[PDB]
Amino acid sequence: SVLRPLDKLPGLNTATILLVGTEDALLQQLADSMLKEDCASELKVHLAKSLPLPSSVNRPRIDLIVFVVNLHSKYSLQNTEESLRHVDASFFLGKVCFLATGAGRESHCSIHRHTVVKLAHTYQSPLLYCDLEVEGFRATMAQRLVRVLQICAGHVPGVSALNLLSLLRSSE
Amino acid sequence: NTEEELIRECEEMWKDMEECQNKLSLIGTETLTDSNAQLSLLIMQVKCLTAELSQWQKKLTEDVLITLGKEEFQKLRQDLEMVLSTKESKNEKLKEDLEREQRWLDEQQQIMESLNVLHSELKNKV
Amino acid sequence: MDSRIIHENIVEKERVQRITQETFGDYPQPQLEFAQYKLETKFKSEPLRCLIKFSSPHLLEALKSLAPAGIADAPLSPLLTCIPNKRMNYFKIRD
């Protein structure tokens, strides 16, 4: 089931986020950091291990896609590229983002960061580096994700997803 | 009042949104692999850019104005204190930096006269 | 508990935890510290001869947590689920 950003209608001032990865505990902690504070708009969090997403007739709009990647394991990579085949190209227009964890510890980074940099640059998608283990870094990434959600969801008048993509674009 | 008209217009644009949603849904979504993803995404992005450019090219009562004005004066009065406090903090910061600059200038001065007199003494000796 | 979060694939999580609990059990597993399998099986991908050693200060617990951590499949292979059952610690496998 290929996911589409333009399937249904969203709720009244409602925003949704999707997190796809392997480490369930890290996803739960990241969602806890997400919902530590709530803005004016209500927020829904979805966590999944792989794509295509399980079928559900009651699925609301998923306005943001975030893939967590650990440089500690190639298994998370293979998961990401296998899951990437179950989403349309329209999500790639600023509705998709990549968050790499553990990049600071160069000794613990199994795969080289050049690989994920090339992967992100190939699809022209934003790339973010953070460490979920550290509480401060996790919190900072928490307001970062909340506010990028606010930008992409259309809550603030003036910009869209393609606008922020042209903002967050890398030179090469 | 104006609120009822705003609600009616909101319902109208909700109807327009539903119309657009059911209009767009009759398209095969997409399918891309690694090799041809880049060109496809570039084409989709340029199409969306042209569409939104064309769309943007196509594009009350006194009580609400008064209430919003009162709100904005309250916001300005309640947030100017941060910028002021920054203004003092930078004032004393610049004063301290200026004093340090005169200190360094003074020290390098006698450094210069000492170096010049040493150079002249060595030149005269040889 | 924080109903705003809507976990997806929850059926997979509830199936894997149930299978792990049924295979291992609530009781504290016996404190076993060393395992070693000597295998010789056909490649199917001249048999390949493999030799693995599992070292752990507390086995049967990290193995218990592999499935919840998602490292292994929900049903573990019989070569690891019968350590207290078969009363066997060293194995040999042929094609």
Binding site: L12 | - | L79, I93
Partner: peptide
């Protein structure tokens, strides 16, 4: 049809709520 609540119903709700295969490996080895 879980009665798609009308916008009006959902709106008031939010406003009000601001107070709360086990046989295939034993056959191969």
């Amino acid at each position: 049809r879980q009665a798609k609540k009308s916008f009006s119903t959902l709106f008031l709700e939010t406003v009000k709520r601001k107070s709360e295969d086990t046989k295939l490996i034993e056959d191969e080895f």
